[PDB]
Amino acid sequence: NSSVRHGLTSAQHCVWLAQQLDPRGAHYRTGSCLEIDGPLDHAVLSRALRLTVAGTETLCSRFLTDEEGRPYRAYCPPAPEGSAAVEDPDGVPYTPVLLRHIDLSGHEDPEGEAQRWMDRDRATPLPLDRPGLSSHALFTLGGGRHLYYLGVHHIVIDGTSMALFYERLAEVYRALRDGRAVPAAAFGDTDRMVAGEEAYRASARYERDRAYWTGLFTDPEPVSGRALAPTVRSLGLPPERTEVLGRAAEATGAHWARVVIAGVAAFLHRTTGARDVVVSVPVTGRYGANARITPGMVSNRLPLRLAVRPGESFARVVETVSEAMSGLLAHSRFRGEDLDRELGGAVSGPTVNVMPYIRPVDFGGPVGLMRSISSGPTTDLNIVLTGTPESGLRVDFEGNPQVYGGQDLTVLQERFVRFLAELAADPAATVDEVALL
Numbered sequence: 001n002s003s004v005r006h007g008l009t010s011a012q013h014c015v016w017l018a019q020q021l022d023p024r025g026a027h028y029r030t031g032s033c034l035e036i037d038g039p040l041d042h043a044v045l046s047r048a049l050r051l052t053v054a055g056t057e058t059l060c061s062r063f064l065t066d067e068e069g070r071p072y073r074a075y076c077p078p079a080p081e082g083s084a085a086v087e088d089p090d091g092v093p094y095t096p097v098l099l100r101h102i103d104l105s106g107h108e109d110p111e112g113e114a115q116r117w118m119d120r121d122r123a124t125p126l127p128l129d130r131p132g133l134s135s136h137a138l139f140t141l142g143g144g145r146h147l148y149y150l151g152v153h154h155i156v157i158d159g160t161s162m163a164l165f166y167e168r169l170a171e172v173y174r175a176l177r178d179g180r181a182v183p184a185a186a187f188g189d190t191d192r193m194v195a196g197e198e199a200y201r202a203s204a205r206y207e208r209d210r211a212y213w214t215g216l217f218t219d220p221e222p223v224s225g226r227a228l229a230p231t232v233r234s235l236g237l238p239p240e241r242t243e244v245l246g247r248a249a250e251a252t253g254a255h256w257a258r259v260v261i262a263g264v265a266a267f268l269h270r271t272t273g274a275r276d277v278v279v280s281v282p283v284t285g286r287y288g289a290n291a292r293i294t295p296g297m298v299s300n301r302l303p304l305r306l307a308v309r310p311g312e313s314f315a316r317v318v319e320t321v322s323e324a325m326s327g328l329l330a331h332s333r334f335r336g337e338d339l340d341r342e343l344g345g346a347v348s349g350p351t352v353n354v355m356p357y358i359r360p361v362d363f364g365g366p367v368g369l370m371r372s373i374s375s376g377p378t379t380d381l382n383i384v385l386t387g388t389p390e391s392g393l394r395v396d397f398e399g400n401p402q403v404y405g406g407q408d409l410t411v412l413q414e415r416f417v418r419f420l421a422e423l424a425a426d427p428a429a430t431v432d433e434v435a436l437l
């Protein structure tokens, strides 16, 4: 139904408000891609995309305002497959669906050229009142290799949902190629997920969480302006370099993402001398079965306050992270932006985003591996990891361009990785004694 006014999630309200401060800006454009190791049929994949979008409410939506100016979400189905119509018979715009095909096979540096293309696209503003807030391109790179680019407005798609989209696209593609019925879209309902958030705000737990978070930061100013689209520098680490993180996880008993967060806390402590370190951690903000399967934007960012005292081993820092994360998860439903609103002023540190495992995407032979292009805007620094210690990592340092140049990030990144690796190689060692020239 086209006249129904859908409620925004908390995260979507937050993005909406931020967008109004810079109406024509592109700072909330984000993107990812799949590096695909075998040939795909663009014509079939284009059909697959239309069908994928048609069953993904968030990729069919536009944002409008009531008379008070308050936003709501409106659903705009695409036109039927084959149809060229732009509006339905009642004047409701159809969500356009376009899969660009960019053949770079005869190019000197297909990869580099595709990256420059994605960066140009990420700098393109998408007005929120026009349905279909995404941008798609299939690159042909020669040798039967492809790149699928998914560019979005952050208000419609979070990191979790990117994986949901890629899984669904491939599933649809496989069916179309096999000539099977396309399996039914098994996505959840955004309205129910929003209703869940509303129930939480109305519940006692909200006040408990509020007390908890205000309690922890009643007193600290963030240490290194507006949030801007980052300059992104990316570093590939093969398994030979990353396996050590897995060994550190095994030995400390902590998940490897915690080892990385401990690593960042250690790095900040050594770089700046502060014992009161803060890093921000994204959580998915998805609670319950329906929410876990609803493409959309519900992610939350929460500050992690970590005491790093002199003489401590790296294993002790991992425990500090563990202790702090336990509190954060137990009160995870409280919105980071509401915590900031309460405290006033500017609380945050570098975002440390260790993305969860995503199985390689299967197109029926060809296999797609996901990599981040830009995860979101930043006042300072996002650290984004994709991969696993066993399979290798991609490490992205995403820096506010007023704060960092590309070269600053490369140097920072290289120093951090070498420091993390040596910490991980011996968690018993005192952090302060670990040589970092």
Ligand SMILES: *CCCCCNC(=O)[C@H](C)N
Binding pocket: 011, 014, 015, 018, 154, 282, 299, 301, 337, 351, 375, 376, 377
């Ligand atoms: C005001 C909206 C919430 C913050 C936006 N979230 C992100 O940028 C995530 C970390 N990619």
Ligand SMILES: [Cl-]
Binding pocket: 158, 159, 160, 282, 299
């Ligand atoms: Cl996200």
